[PDB]
Amino acid sequence: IFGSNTIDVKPTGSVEMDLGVRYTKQDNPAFSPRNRSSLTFDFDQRISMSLMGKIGTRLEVNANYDTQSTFAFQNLFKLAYTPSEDDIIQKVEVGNVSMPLNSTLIRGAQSLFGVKTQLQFGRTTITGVFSEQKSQTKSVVAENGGTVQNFDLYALDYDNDRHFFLSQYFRNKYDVSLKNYPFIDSRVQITRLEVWVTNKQNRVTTTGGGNNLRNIIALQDLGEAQVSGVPDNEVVVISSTAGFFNNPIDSPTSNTN
């Protein structure tokens, strides 16, 4: 059933076995007194071995077991039984078998784990396989270099809470200033800008551009003049605008407005 009785399956690699105690103690008063300390047993293994060889000049064994990565395409195991060419059975493969099909319509699977057998009746080659597939098919389309990604947003799926006009002046100027783009009909050039947000992190650090923390009184009607085609109540929240504005109607936004 085998060519000879010699079994020279050579193993290689390393194995580690760590056994010890892990003691932890956190002084959190909110915990129960039963959680004063945690003394557990820490056991770990790092089997990092391979195993290659031939058995009876008919079995080829090739295994790689390494418990330090994703096993789906690292932990390999291959048994190949190849009888004499005179026999009907030409190859029996167990483990990481392959099913390469030279057909465009029907594609085989390259990464399988199971049994693959091959029979040869004179001129007929019957290759059977039964296995579990460890891979997934994925298709990409590339035009002129790299891949092409399609996207389908809808009208409502805009980018919210991220983009803010700096004033009602800029908001009401936007459409008219972009009437003849790429020419922007606006001489405004914003030179300086500082933005303050709610501080929930409360993390003081010299490397994050300094440590600036100020009390802030953010007003809504600050720097607000009227607008030509927009009523005042759409520009300011103040109940009465009588005696509020002290600049012409279309004045640019400024503290003095």
Binding site: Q110, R123, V129, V140, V148, R162, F164, I217
Partner: protein, 433 residues
């Protein structure tokens, strides 16, 4: 905020934060801009504001502390109110292209469609009425592509103005596009609101802010409530969210096609140029470790033909167990004639007896008969030798490869409810978190 936590448009006057403020976070700004020779300021800066603290006294017993606030302008409020002008400061015309990073022109197409129920590149009037007569050349709606309707196409490839546009999205990297973040900004602040309302307006008696006066054409196309209300509050108006921004963008980065996987199996990559399968040793090369496919065919590199690359990547986590079984006959009629009878069956084992929509299991079978016939034709070699300056002795070859495949699909018997293949639109278990 640091300068790397936001960007801003110095000309159009709006900030774009790096982090979304979807909660009670308050946004306040102080900015200084120039209009020619005039300088305007709207908040108090740290440089020119009051001192943070003023202390009056000698020791801690009599010292008086006065901590003072900077006066800034509110952009986002603590409590959300949509009937306030501070709500209008948020820009609702910016659309983030999903996972786009560095969108570049000639590798970016955008289009606006009206899905009702099919993607259509224009807008038809409500039956019984018609679009406003004699519109301006920039207010055409009838028989007009939607890029022209929403003012996203008025320039040619080189950004020079054109009469009806070129039918392509106007890619201006400072007005309509944000290159470093992959965002598309519309040229109007309310494109699907006041813009299309003005396009469809038939008289001065209709006001955008009074939806009771719309003329039955604005009652269908004007999506006012996505700008006057939150997105969740705009989900109530279901019949308006019909405009679809559909497009593509090409990501290359480096030299070669990134197949989206690493350490792919040898021989698992199939590349098809224009319905024909390329040869892995001739027309392209594969770097498996880096997952790159480089097209080596000179005529195919400069061809604009969409190349489809299919690969079986084993770097998957969470996929159901797939049972692959089947056989393959390889009858050899002669020394140059092969007939194959491949039969394959792929089943999947769902994690649960219930299959939700999208996580569907397959029980497919595919069987095919193929035939290969490769011969040498010395007639072609002699004909080539009959050519003026050709006297080569390399033999000519012919090869005919036919194949027929049948796919009988099914669903696994495990995911069957009362004997029929079942997919759960909603089992009502995923609600109420």
């Amino acid at each position: 905020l640091t300068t790397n936590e936001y960007t801003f448009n110095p000309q159009l006057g709006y900030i774009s934060l790096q982090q979304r403020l979807a909660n009670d976070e308050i946004l306040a700004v102080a900015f200084e801009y120039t209009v020619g020779g005039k300088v305007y300021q709207v908040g108090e800066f740290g440089s020119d504001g009051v001192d943070a603290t003023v202390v009056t006294g000698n020791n801690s017993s009599n010292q008086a502390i006065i901590t003072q606030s900077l006066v800034l302008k509110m952009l986002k409020s603590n409590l959300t109110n949509v009937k306030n002008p501070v709500w209008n400061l948020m820009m609702k015309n910016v659309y983030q292209i999903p996972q786009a990073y560095q969108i570049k022109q000639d590798d970016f197409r955008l289009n606006i469609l009206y899905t009702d129920p099919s993607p259509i590149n224009y807008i038809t009037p409500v039956q019984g009425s018609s679009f406003p007569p004699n519109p301006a050349p920039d207010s055409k709606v009838e028989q007009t592509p939607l890029l022209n309707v929403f003012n996203l196409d008025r320039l040619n490839y080189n950004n020079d103005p054109q009469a009806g546009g070129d039918g392509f999205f106007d890619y201006i990297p400072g007005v309509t596009v944000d290159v470093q973040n992959g965002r598309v900004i519309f040229t109007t602040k309310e494109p699907f609101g006041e813009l299309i309302f003005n396009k469809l307006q038939t008289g001065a008696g209709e006001s955008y802010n009074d939806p009771t006066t719309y003329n039955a054409n604005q009652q269908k196309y004007v999506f006012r409530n996505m700008y006057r209300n939150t997105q969740a509050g705009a989900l109530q108006d279901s019949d308006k969210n019909k405009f679809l921004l559909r497009g593509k963008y090409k990501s290359s980065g480096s030299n070669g096609i990134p197949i989206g996987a690493f350490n792919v199996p040898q021989g698992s990559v199939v590349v098809t140029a224009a319905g024909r399968v390329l040869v892995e040793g001739i027309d392209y090369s594969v770097d498996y470790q880096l997952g790159r496919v480089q097209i080596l065919d000179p005529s195919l590199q400069a061809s604009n033909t969409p190349i489809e690359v299919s690969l079986e990547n084993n770097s998957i986590f969470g996929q159901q167990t797939r049972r692959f079984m089947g056989f393959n006959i390889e009858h050899k009629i002669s020394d140059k004639f092969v007939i194959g009878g491949t039969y394959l069956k792929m089943t999947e084992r769902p994690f649960t007896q219930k299959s939700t929509y999208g996580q569907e299991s397959v029980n497919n079978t595919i069987f095919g008969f193929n035939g290969n016939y490769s011969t040498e034709v010395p007639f072609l070699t002699r004909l080539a030798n009959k050519l003026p300056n050709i006297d080569t002795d390399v033999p000519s070859n012919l090869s005919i490869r036919g194949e027929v495949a049948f796919l009988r699909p099914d669903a696994p018997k495990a995911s069957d409810f009362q004997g029929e293949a079942t997919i759960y639109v909603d089992d009502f278990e995923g609600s109420q978190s």
